[PDB]
Amino acid sequence: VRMHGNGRGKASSALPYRRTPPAWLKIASRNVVKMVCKSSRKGMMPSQIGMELRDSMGIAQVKNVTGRKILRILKHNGLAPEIPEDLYFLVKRATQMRKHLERHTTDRDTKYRLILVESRIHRLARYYKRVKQLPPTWKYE
Amino acid sequence: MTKTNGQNAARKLVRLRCRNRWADKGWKRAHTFSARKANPFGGSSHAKGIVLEKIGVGAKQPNSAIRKCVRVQLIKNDKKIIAFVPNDGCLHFIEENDEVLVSGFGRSGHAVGDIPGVRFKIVKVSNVGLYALYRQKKEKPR
Amino acid sequence: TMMSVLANALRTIASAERRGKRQVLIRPSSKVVVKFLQVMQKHGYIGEFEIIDDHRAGKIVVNLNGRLNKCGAICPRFDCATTDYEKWMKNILPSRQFGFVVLTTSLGIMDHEEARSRNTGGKVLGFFY
Amino acid sequence: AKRTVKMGVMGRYGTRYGANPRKRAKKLEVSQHAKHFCSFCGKFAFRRKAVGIWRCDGCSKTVAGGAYTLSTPNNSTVRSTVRRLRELAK
RNA sequence: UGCUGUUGCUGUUAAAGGGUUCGUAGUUGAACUGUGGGCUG
RNA sequence: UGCAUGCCGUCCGUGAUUUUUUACUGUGACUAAAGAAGCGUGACUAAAGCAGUCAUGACUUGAAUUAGAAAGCAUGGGAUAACAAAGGAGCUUUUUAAAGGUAUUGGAGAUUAUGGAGCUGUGCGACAAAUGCUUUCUAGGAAUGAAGGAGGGUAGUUCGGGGGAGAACGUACUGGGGCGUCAGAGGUGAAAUUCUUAGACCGCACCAAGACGAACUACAGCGAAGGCAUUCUUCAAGGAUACCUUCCUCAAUCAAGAACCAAAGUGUGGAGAUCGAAGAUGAUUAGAGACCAUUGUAGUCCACACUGCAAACGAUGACACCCAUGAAUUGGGGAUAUCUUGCACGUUUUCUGUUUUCACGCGAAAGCUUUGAGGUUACAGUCUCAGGGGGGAGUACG
RNA sequence: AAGUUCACCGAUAUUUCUUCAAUAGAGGAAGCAAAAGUCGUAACAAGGUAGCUGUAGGUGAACCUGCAGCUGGAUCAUUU
RNA sequence: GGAAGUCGGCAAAAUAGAUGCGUAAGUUCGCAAGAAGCAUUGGCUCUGAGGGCAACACAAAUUGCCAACUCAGAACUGCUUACGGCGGGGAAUCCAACUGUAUAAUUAAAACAUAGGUUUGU
RNA sequence: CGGGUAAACGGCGGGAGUAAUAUGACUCUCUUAAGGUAGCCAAAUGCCUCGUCUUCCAAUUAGAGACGCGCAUGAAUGGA
Ligand SMILES: [Mg+2]
Ligand SMILES: [Mg+2]
Ligand SMILES: [Mg+2]
Ligand SMILES: [Mg+2]
Ligand SMILES: [Mg+2]
Ligand SMILES: [Mg+2]
Ligand SMILES: [Mg+2]
Ligand SMILES: [Mg+2]
Ligand SMILES: [Mg+2]
Ligand SMILES: [Mg+2]
Ligand SMILES: [Mg+2]
Ligand SMILES: [Mg+2]
Ligand SMILES: [Mg+2]
Ligand SMILES: [Mg+2]
Ligand SMILES: [Mg+2]
Ligand SMILES: [Mg+2]
Ligand SMILES: [Mg+2]
Ligand SMILES: [Mg+2]
Ligand SMILES: [Mg+2]
Ligand SMILES: [Mg+2]
Ligand SMILES: [Mg+2]
Ligand SMILES: [Zn+2]
């Protein structure tokens, strides 16, 4: 995490050069799309949908099997979340911290972290309003 | 890591130079008015005045002498200054209530030599050059 | 963060040449970097180089022959008319008998001698000698 | 517009009684006249009638305690202590 | 007089990095759509 | 006064149909002299001037040419860039048959059918389609990529003197009684103020209260900095690592503006063991208001509200790239000897952190050196703060 | 033509407010330049109580004392 | 003429309503403040603004009837400045913080009280 | 007889003499329970007294600002 703090970590996934299915995967593309929509109806977010297909279902890189990305499939079917996924998680974190701080008013370390999180929300909401993914008057609390 | 470099960063560079020019002691003196008011001359190279009395100023250590001077009241603004009288003798040529022409001492208001606090010099008395009298090329009038 | 890809690459080549290395790896690459290297190659200042594809900004491996003294970029990219070539030559080149200033013009990327012959101006990119 | 720069409720006193006594009394006056949270209802509905008496505006509850605020800081400590000691007993 | 520094200055100890962060105007900002070819000397 | 008239590409005006600038660069146009540059010229030379030269006059005499910021005008060139838009599910053509509903008739003004053309609902012929209808279970498959840039997710229910809350432990300093004893104890270089047969000091087991958390404890760990060390329970966070998860430029750094910030100090309530500014009393000393001894008020500790200063130091601003060798060490992960009965350890790689042995090189030197104070007169990666001989002075005024 | 009355432009004077620049003053402070009387020795050596920074109190005078910090220290180093 | 009177501006004079503009030092930020100061005001004849209830389609965004008073603007015309009622203002020193109480019949104050501070017994 | 206590009643001199024209930073002595500290002043508190300097007037035993040898100022008998 480099936007705030002193972290300089480099840990992530590395996508392969060869973008073809491994040829032992017999699932058709239309079955994978129906397979994505069913997981959404259960209540899972797109980042969790990809992991469930990767772990116990043989599908790495849904985009390589079906030419589309997971969020694009959900948007077509009307199952996209109202607020973008990363904004939803940041707002949830700020709410839990604010609930903690009314009981513990001397936790000055947590007050410092809340200022960092709220700045991140305003920066992120600024971008989504510009690319028209949010209403122009969204106005985080 | 000392200056900005952008292609559209002219405004920052202009403002930076303007504020840092004031730190130059010489530049500031020529662009303000406090020095001009302080200067007994109103920014001129010479001035005329009336001799009030003759005084002697002790030379600063490690020198030892009595430097002959006079105190003058300027005609243009009634300010009082102290002017050095150069050359051997040359004090007898100057009498009280005489008109003199005073000039600078060569360091633009700074004191010169072992004479403490003296920045002016006499060059003319009674409309006759002081050095001319010293060489006996002219006679003291009246 | 990294602001200029061309400046990063030219600094890497110059350091490896100063240390007496034979090969140098450059990352990341771009179209401007490749064109600059070809101007150097045409005048005999570097050997062959290879571009590797990785589905991102690729990498370049360059062979050095010991003839390069210094290469560097000019930032920002000042405009240069056809009457300003003499001024740039006297300011950043060791002499008037060797060394080149590289420009980008409407006719493409070229050295100052070729640009003057075709009567075109442009923006300064870098230099080498 | 604001109508006052930092006097607040104590503007009714004019220039009388001194700055520090006024500033000390203002803090308790604001609390004494505020609306406090009713945990039975879930709304901000408790008002003070007389010293120590707090009445809910909607539900018919009356509570004892505080004299200028609904709950004093010592009472919360007493509550947690009593609950833990009873938890040991039972 | 490269002692006003765009070309072109200094900032550990000589004068000079703000106690540490957040942040708006401002300045700066990664790669990609792109070898024309065939016949003579 | 017909005196007259005949023997395919373009030009020009007007309507219909839909879209690329700016910037840079090359030419060109339009731009008072005097002044500057300079072509010619033996005013006797020169500073000058524009004149003059040669055989009823000629030189069809000469007085050339250039540069002058920026903005404005026309045009051609597309590499580096700027502006604006968008945020990807608000996304077929052609040919015939039919039904329905102005201009030419001599010119001028009225009434009238027939047709053109568009508006549509029926059949027919021919050809495409960037995503298979002889299809799948009836608009839903055609979209640059995923930065050794940023954000988010999942896991070891990982890691740590990181933060907040609550219960409970540990000796020690001080005090108090309970049991004993009896002549001094304390303190110093040496003493004295001070305590003591009304029992001090010393000894044993306790009780009260307030602080603190030894040894383990280190060129170790955590935190933005200030800072952080007993155990158990509890609340919200933070970093690194692993990933063929998601997203697609969301970033770097800063006037204004905002939050935190050792100690001392200030206000209001608590607390008051220890130590201890002010003060008191002994000693040293020529003097001693000090250093030393015995004390002692504010303070030192807690809650809430202020203050915003430190040799707040690595006296070294933030982000990014390259860089020689061998160690060591903290956390996570990958591969393959020892010991206890899942843990620890051994060897070798790897990502992050944190250090030590004059690397090249740099520097006035001291010194710095993958961790720069290196890669700079061979001077240009990005942003930002400060300095310009010594004082007066961080003072005066606002 | 002189002259009457009204509106408009408006010099000039006085009064009131605002801004700029200069100016006297019993008494109280600061700095510098001297000369060199008077009294001590804070700093530089472990400078004879290591020094210095911030803050608070005291004091004929340099200064002394308490609290926290630094080495620019008089130690780069001892349950491996 | 304008405090020269007198221990002392005692007494008297003086200011004056309403509306617009404008307003210093100091300060516990509330004030000081009606600070200070400048201007207008009659009568008559007009003009404008401010209302009520009755008659999926969007200028009933209009027709009629009627009350009660205030404010603003204009023309013309006049003063002998003309009922009553109604603050004089400024710069400073001493004392007491303030509102209050208080010698019925010579003392209203700087005295007493007060909020605030501290100590004692239990 | 021993301790304690001044936001208990109260007290805060007897004084002297030395020093850089002045003067006293400087020294010596006498002496107490302790020897007036921060402040303030010819004050509703100063005898001498209509004190001395500046300001206010033509002229001020009055007013204000300064000074301090304070007959006899001064800290909850509360000081500013
Ligand atoms: Mg990415
Ligand atoms: Mg004991
Ligand atoms: Mg005992
Ligand atoms: Mg403290
Ligand atoms: Mg001693
Ligand atoms: Mg003690
Ligand atoms: Mg002496
Ligand atoms: Mg010493
Ligand atoms: Mg009069
Ligand atoms: Mg009189
Ligand atoms: Mg009289
Ligand atoms: Mg009267
Ligand atoms: Mg008035
Ligand atoms: Mg009263
Ligand atoms: Mg009253
Ligand atoms: Mg009476
Ligand atoms: Mg009476
Ligand atoms: Mg009273
Ligand atoms: Mg007096
Ligand atoms: Mg009088
Ligand atoms: Mg007086
Ligand atoms: Zn209720």
PDB file of N, CA and C in Angstrom, chain C residues 21-87:
ATOM      1  N   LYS C  21      30.456  -2.653 -19.718  1.00  0.00           N
ATOM      2  CA  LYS C  21      29.640  -3.828 -19.964  1.00  0.00           C
ATOM      3  C   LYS C  21      29.442  -4.045 -21.461  1.00  0.00           C
ATOM      4  N   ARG C  22      29.144  -5.290 -21.820  1.00  0.00           N
ATOM      5  CA  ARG C  22      28.937  -5.661 -23.212  1.00  0.00           C
ATOM      6  C   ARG C  22      27.473  -5.702 -23.615  1.00  0.00           C
ATOM      7  N   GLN C  23      26.579  -6.035 -22.692  1.00  0.00           N
ATOM      8  CA  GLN C  23      25.149  -6.068 -22.952  1.00  0.00           C
ATOM      9  C   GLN C  23      24.423  -5.309 -21.853  1.00  0.00           C
ATOM     10  N   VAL C  24      23.287  -4.721 -22.207  1.00  0.00           N
ATOM     11  CA  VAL C  24      22.473  -3.976 -21.257  1.00  0.00           C
ATOM     12  C   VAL C  24      21.002  -4.233 -21.557  1.00  0.00           C
ATOM     13  N   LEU C  25      20.221  -4.451 -20.505  1.00  0.00           N
ATOM     14  CA  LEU C  25      18.787  -4.676 -20.621  1.00  0.00           C
ATOM     15  C   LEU C  25      18.045  -3.385 -20.304  1.00  0.00           C
ATOM     16  N   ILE C  26      17.076  -3.040 -21.145  1.00  0.00           N
ATOM     17  CA  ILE C  26      16.311  -1.804 -21.029  1.00  0.00           C
ATOM     18  C   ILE C  26      14.848  -2.163 -20.824  1.00  0.00           C
ATOM     19  N   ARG C  27      14.218  -1.536 -19.832  1.00  0.00           N
ATOM     20  CA  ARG C  27      12.828  -1.784 -19.534  1.00  0.00           C
ATOM     21  C   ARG C  27      12.243  -0.543 -18.874  1.00  0.00           C
ATOM     22  N   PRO C  28      11.047  -0.099 -19.272  1.00  0.00           N
ATOM     23  CA  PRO C  28      10.219  -0.583 -20.382  1.00  0.00           C
ATOM     24  C   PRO C  28      10.617   0.051 -21.707  1.00  0.00           C
ATOM     25  N   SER C  29      10.017  -0.378 -22.810  1.00  0.00           N
ATOM     26  CA  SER C  29      10.336   0.113 -24.141  1.00  0.00           C
ATOM     27  C   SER C  29       9.161   0.898 -24.714  1.00  0.00           C
ATOM     28  N   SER C  30       9.402   1.531 -25.859  1.00  0.00           N
ATOM     29  CA  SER C  30       8.379   2.295 -26.562  1.00  0.00           C
ATOM     30  C   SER C  30       8.855   2.532 -27.989  1.00  0.00           C
ATOM     31  N   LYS C  31       7.966   3.102 -28.807  1.00  0.00           N
ATOM     32  CA  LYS C  31       8.314   3.403 -30.193  1.00  0.00           C
ATOM     33  C   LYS C  31       9.409   4.457 -30.281  1.00  0.00           C
ATOM     34  N   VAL C  32       9.351   5.473 -29.421  1.00  0.00           N
ATOM     35  CA  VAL C  32      10.351   6.538 -29.448  1.00  0.00           C
ATOM     36  C   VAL C  32      11.731   5.990 -29.104  1.00  0.00           C
ATOM     37  N   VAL C  33      11.798   5.052 -28.160  1.00  0.00           N
ATOM     38  CA  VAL C  33      13.082   4.479 -27.763  1.00  0.00           C
ATOM     39  C   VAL C  33      13.697   3.683 -28.909  1.00  0.00           C
ATOM     40  N   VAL C  34      12.877   2.917 -29.630  1.00  0.00           N
ATOM     41  CA  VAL C  34      13.388   2.102 -30.728  1.00  0.00           C
ATOM     42  C   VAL C  34      13.935   2.981 -31.847  1.00  0.00           C
ATOM     43  N   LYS C  35      13.230   4.064 -32.177  1.00  0.00           N
ATOM     44  CA  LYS C  35      13.698   4.955 -33.236  1.00  0.00           C
ATOM     45  C   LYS C  35      15.007   5.636 -32.856  1.00  0.00           C
ATOM     46  N   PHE C  36      15.151   6.024 -31.588  1.00  0.00           N
ATOM     47  CA  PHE C  36      16.396   6.632 -31.133  1.00  0.00           C
ATOM     48  C   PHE C  36      17.562   5.660 -31.258  1.00  0.00           C
ATOM     49  N   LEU C  37      17.338   4.389 -30.919  1.00  0.00           N
ATOM     50  CA  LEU C  37      18.407   3.401 -31.003  1.00  0.00           C
ATOM     51  C   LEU C  37      18.831   3.157 -32.446  1.00  0.00           C
ATOM     52  N   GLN C  38      17.890   3.244 -33.386  1.00  0.00           N
ATOM     53  CA  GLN C  38      18.224   3.014 -34.787  1.00  0.00           C
ATOM     54  C   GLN C  38      19.072   4.145 -35.357  1.00  0.00           C
ATOM     55  N   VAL C  39      18.865   5.375 -34.886  1.00  0.00           N
ATOM     56  CA  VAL C  39      19.737   6.473 -35.289  1.00  0.00           C
ATOM     57  C   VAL C  39      21.158   6.222 -34.801  1.00  0.00           C
ATOM     58  N   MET C  40      21.299   5.751 -33.561  1.00  0.00           N
ATOM     59  CA  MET C  40      22.611   5.388 -33.037  1.00  0.00           C
ATOM     60  C   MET C  40      23.244   4.266 -33.852  1.00  0.00           C
ATOM     61  N   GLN C  41      22.451   3.256 -34.209  1.00  0.00           N
ATOM     62  CA  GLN C  41      22.969   2.108 -34.944  1.00  0.00           C
ATOM     63  C   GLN C  41      23.464   2.506 -36.327  1.00  0.00           C
ATOM     64  N   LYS C  42      22.742   3.404 -36.996  1.00  0.00           N
ATOM     65  CA  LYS C  42      23.094   3.791 -38.356  1.00  0.00           C
ATOM     66  C   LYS C  42      24.461   4.454 -38.411  1.00  0.00           C
ATOM     67  N   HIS C  43      24.820   5.192 -37.367  1.00  0.00           N
ATOM     68  CA  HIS C  43      26.104   5.867 -37.298  1.00  0.00           C
ATOM     69  C   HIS C  43      27.181   5.027 -36.628  1.00  0.00           C
ATOM     70  N   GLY C  44      26.873   3.789 -36.253  1.00  0.00           N
ATOM     71  CA  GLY C  44      27.878   2.870 -35.766  1.00  0.00           C
ATOM     72  C   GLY C  44      28.244   2.988 -34.306  1.00  0.00           C
ATOM     73  N   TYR C  45      27.368   3.542 -33.474  1.00  0.00           N
ATOM     74  CA  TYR C  45      27.687   3.719 -32.066  1.00  0.00           C
ATOM     75  C   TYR C  45      27.262   2.548 -31.190  1.00  0.00           C
ATOM     76  N   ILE C  46      26.361   1.687 -31.663  1.00  0.00           N
ATOM     77  CA  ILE C  46      25.991   0.462 -30.962  1.00  0.00           C
ATOM     78  C   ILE C  46      25.896  -0.664 -31.983  1.00  0.00           C
ATOM     79  N   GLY C  47      25.851  -1.891 -31.476  1.00  0.00           N
ATOM     80  CA  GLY C  47      25.699  -3.054 -32.328  1.00  0.00           C
ATOM     81  C   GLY C  47      24.252  -3.396 -32.600  1.00  0.00           C
ATOM     82  N   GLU C  48      23.928  -4.680 -32.600  1.00  0.00           N
ATOM     83  CA  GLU C  48      22.557  -5.120 -32.779  1.00  0.00           C
ATOM     84  C   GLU C  48      21.815  -5.120 -31.449  1.00  0.00           C
ATOM     85  N   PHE C  49      20.490  -5.046 -31.529  1.00  0.00           N
ATOM     86  CA  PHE C  49      19.654  -5.156 -30.347  1.00  0.00           C
ATOM     87  C   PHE C  49      18.419  -5.981 -30.674  1.00  0.00           C
ATOM     88  N   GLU C  50      17.814  -6.537 -29.630  1.00  0.00           N
ATOM     89  CA  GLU C  50      16.670  -7.426 -29.756  1.00  0.00           C
ATOM     90  C   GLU C  50      15.518  -6.933 -28.893  1.00  0.00           C
ATOM     91  N   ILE C  51      14.319  -6.936 -29.467  1.00  0.00           N
ATOM     92  CA  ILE C  51      13.098  -6.533 -28.777  1.00  0.00           C
ATOM     93  C   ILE C  51      12.325  -7.785 -28.394  1.00  0.00           C
ATOM     94  N   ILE C  52      11.954  -7.893 -27.122  1.00  0.00           N
ATOM     95  CA  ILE C  52      11.248  -9.058 -26.598  1.00  0.00           C
ATOM     96  C   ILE C  52       9.809  -8.666 -26.300  1.00  0.00           C
ATOM     97  N   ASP C  53       8.873  -9.502 -26.736  1.00  0.00           N
ATOM     98  CA  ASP C  53       7.452  -9.266 -26.536  1.00  0.00           C
ATOM     99  C   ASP C  53       6.962  -9.993 -25.291  1.00  0.00           C
ATOM    100  N   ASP C  54       6.166  -9.292 -24.477  1.00  0.00           N
ATOM    101  CA  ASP C  54       5.630  -9.891 -23.262  1.00  0.00           C
ATOM    102  C   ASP C  54       4.172  -9.516 -23.012  1.00  0.00           C
ATOM    103  N   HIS C  55       3.456  -9.045 -24.033  1.00  0.00           N
ATOM    104  CA  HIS C  55       2.071  -8.583 -23.963  1.00  0.00           C
ATOM    105  C   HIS C  55       1.912  -7.321 -23.126  1.00  0.00           C
ATOM    106  N   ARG C  56       3.014  -6.730 -22.675  1.00  0.00           N
ATOM    107  CA  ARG C  56       3.032  -5.433 -22.015  1.00  0.00           C
ATOM    108  C   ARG C  56       4.037  -4.562 -22.753  1.00  0.00           C
ATOM    109  N   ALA C  57       4.442  -3.442 -22.165  1.00  0.00           N
ATOM    110  CA  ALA C  57       5.604  -2.737 -22.689  1.00  0.00           C
ATOM    111  C   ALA C  57       6.819  -3.657 -22.619  1.00  0.00           C
ATOM    112  N   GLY C  58       7.408  -3.973 -23.766  1.00  0.00           N
ATOM    113  CA  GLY C  58       8.427  -4.997 -23.841  1.00  0.00           C
ATOM    114  C   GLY C  58       9.765  -4.552 -23.278  1.00  0.00           C
ATOM    115  N   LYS C  59      10.779  -5.368 -23.557  1.00  0.00           N
ATOM    116  CA  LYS C  59      12.139  -5.131 -23.100  1.00  0.00           C
ATOM    117  C   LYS C  59      13.096  -5.187 -24.282  1.00  0.00           C
ATOM    118  N   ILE C  60      14.249  -4.542 -24.124  1.00  0.00           N
ATOM    119  CA  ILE C  60      15.265  -4.476 -25.167  1.00  0.00           C
ATOM    120  C   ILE C  60      16.605  -4.903 -24.591  1.00  0.00           C
ATOM    121  N   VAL C  61      17.311  -5.761 -25.323  1.00  0.00           N
ATOM    122  CA  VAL C  61      18.684  -6.142 -25.014  1.00  0.00           C
ATOM    123  C   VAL C  61      19.569  -5.558 -26.105  1.00  0.00           C
ATOM    124  N   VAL C  62      20.551  -4.750 -25.711  1.00  0.00           N
ATOM    125  CA  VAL C  62      21.402  -4.014 -26.638  1.00  0.00           C
ATOM    126  C   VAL C  62      22.836  -4.498 -26.488  1.00  0.00           C
ATOM    127  N   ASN C  63      23.525  -4.657 -27.615  1.00  0.00           N
ATOM    128  CA  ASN C  63      24.940  -5.005 -27.636  1.00  0.00           C
ATOM    129  C   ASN C  63      25.772  -3.739 -27.787  1.00  0.00           C
ATOM    130  N   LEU C  64      26.766  -3.577 -26.922  1.00  0.00           N
ATOM    131  CA  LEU C  64      27.633  -2.408 -26.929  1.00  0.00           C
ATOM    132  C   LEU C  64      29.000  -2.780 -27.485  1.00  0.00           C
ATOM    133  N   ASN C  65      29.599  -1.856 -28.237  1.00  0.00           N
ATOM    134  CA  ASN C  65      30.877  -2.084 -28.900  1.00  0.00           C
ATOM    135  C   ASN C  65      31.992  -1.180 -28.383  1.00  0.00           C
ATOM    136  N   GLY C  66      31.743  -0.415 -27.325  1.00  0.00           N
ATOM    137  CA  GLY C  66      32.766   0.389 -26.698  1.00  0.00           C
ATOM    138  C   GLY C  66      32.993   1.759 -27.298  1.00  0.00           C
ATOM    139  N   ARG C  67      32.283   2.114 -28.366  1.00  0.00           N
ATOM    140  CA  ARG C  67      32.513   3.375 -29.054  1.00  0.00           C
ATOM    141  C   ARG C  67      31.675   4.526 -28.511  1.00  0.00           C
ATOM    142  N   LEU C  68      30.724   4.255 -27.624  1.00  0.00           N
ATOM    143  CA  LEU C  68      29.843   5.285 -27.092  1.00  0.00           C
ATOM    144  C   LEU C  68      30.483   5.935 -25.872  1.00  0.00           C
ATOM    145  N   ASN C  69      30.484   7.265 -25.839  1.00  0.00           N
ATOM    146  CA  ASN C  69      31.014   8.002 -24.698  1.00  0.00           C
ATOM    147  C   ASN C  69      29.917   8.443 -23.739  1.00  0.00           C
ATOM    148  N   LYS C  70      28.870   9.082 -24.252  1.00  0.00           N
ATOM    149  CA  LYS C  70      27.756   9.512 -23.423  1.00  0.00           C
ATOM    150  C   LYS C  70      26.522   9.678 -24.297  1.00  0.00           C
ATOM    151  N   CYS C  71      25.370   9.296 -23.759  1.00  0.00           N
ATOM    152  CA  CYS C  71      24.082   9.592 -24.365  1.00  0.00           C
ATOM    153  C   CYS C  71      23.138  10.090 -23.283  1.00  0.00           C
ATOM    154  N   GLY C  72      22.267  11.023 -23.643  1.00  0.00           N
ATOM    155  CA  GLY C  72      21.341  11.573 -22.673  1.00  0.00           C
ATOM    156  C   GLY C  72      20.178  12.262 -23.340  1.00  0.00           C
ATOM    157  N   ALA C  73      19.128  12.469 -22.558  1.00  0.00           N
ATOM    158  CA  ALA C  73      17.924  13.136 -23.021  1.00  0.00           C
ATOM    159  C   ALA C  73      17.948  14.609 -22.635  1.00  0.00           C
ATOM    160  N   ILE C  74      17.121  15.386 -23.322  1.00  0.00           N
ATOM    161  CA  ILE C  74      16.923  16.799 -23.028  1.00  0.00           C
ATOM    162  C   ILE C  74      15.472  16.981 -22.615  1.00  0.00           C
ATOM    163  N   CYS C  75      15.259  17.507 -21.413  1.00  0.00           N
ATOM    164  CA  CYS C  75      13.925  17.717 -20.874  1.00  0.00           C
ATOM    165  C   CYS C  75      13.847  19.126 -20.300  1.00  0.00           C
ATOM    166  N   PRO C  76      12.836  19.916 -20.663  1.00  0.00           N
ATOM    167  CA  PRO C  76      11.738  19.612 -21.587  1.00  0.00           C
ATOM    168  C   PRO C  76      12.197  19.629 -23.040  1.00  0.00           C
ATOM    169  N   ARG C  77      11.351  19.205 -23.971  1.00  0.00           N
ATOM    170  CA  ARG C  77      11.726  19.119 -25.379  1.00  0.00           C
ATOM    171  C   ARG C  77      11.525  20.479 -26.032  1.00  0.00           C
ATOM    172  N   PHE C  78      12.569  21.300 -25.986  1.00  0.00           N
ATOM    173  CA  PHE C  78      12.498  22.653 -26.519  1.00  0.00           C
ATOM    174  C   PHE C  78      12.331  22.641 -28.035  1.00  0.00           C
ATOM    175  N   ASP C  79      11.617  23.643 -28.540  1.00  0.00           N
ATOM    176  CA  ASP C  79      11.470  23.809 -29.979  1.00  0.00           C
ATOM    177  C   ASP C  79      12.761  24.340 -30.585  1.00  0.00           C
ATOM    178  N   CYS C  80      13.084  23.861 -31.783  1.00  0.00           N
ATOM    179  CA  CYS C  80      14.303  24.254 -32.481  1.00  0.00           C
ATOM    180  C   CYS C  80      13.958  24.588 -33.926  1.00  0.00           C
ATOM    181  N   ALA C  81      14.126  25.851 -34.300  1.00  0.00           N
ATOM    182  CA  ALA C  81      14.010  26.254 -35.690  1.00  0.00           C
ATOM    183  C   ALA C  81      15.304  25.933 -36.435  1.00  0.00           C
ATOM    184  N   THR C  82      15.275  26.112 -37.756  1.00  0.00           N
ATOM    185  CA  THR C  82      16.450  25.816 -38.566  1.00  0.00           C
ATOM    186  C   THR C  82      17.611  26.763 -38.295  1.00  0.00           C
ATOM    187  N   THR C  83      17.370  27.901 -37.652  1.00  0.00           N
ATOM    188  CA  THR C  83      18.435  28.827 -37.295  1.00  0.00           C
ATOM    189  C   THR C  83      19.005  28.570 -35.906  1.00  0.00           C
ATOM    190  N   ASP C  84      18.436  27.637 -35.147  1.00  0.00           N
ATOM    191  CA  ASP C  84      18.905  27.342 -33.801  1.00  0.00           C
ATOM    192  C   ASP C  84      19.820  26.127 -33.736  1.00  0.00           C
ATOM    193  N   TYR C  85      20.128  25.497 -34.872  1.00  0.00           N
ATOM    194  CA  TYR C  85      20.980  24.312 -34.845  1.00  0.00           C
ATOM    195  C   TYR C  85      22.382  24.655 -34.365  1.00  0.00           C
ATOM    196  N   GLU C  86      22.907  25.804 -34.796  1.00  0.00           N
ATOM    197  CA  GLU C  86      24.248  26.209 -34.395  1.00  0.00           C
ATOM    198  C   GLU C  86      24.339  26.404 -32.889  1.00  0.00           C
ATOM    199  N   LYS C  87      23.314  27.009 -32.289  1.00  0.00           N
ATOM    200  CA  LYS C  87      23.327  27.256 -30.850  1.00  0.00           C
ATOM    201  C   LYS C  87      23.325  25.953 -30.060  1.00  0.00           C
TER     202      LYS C  87
END
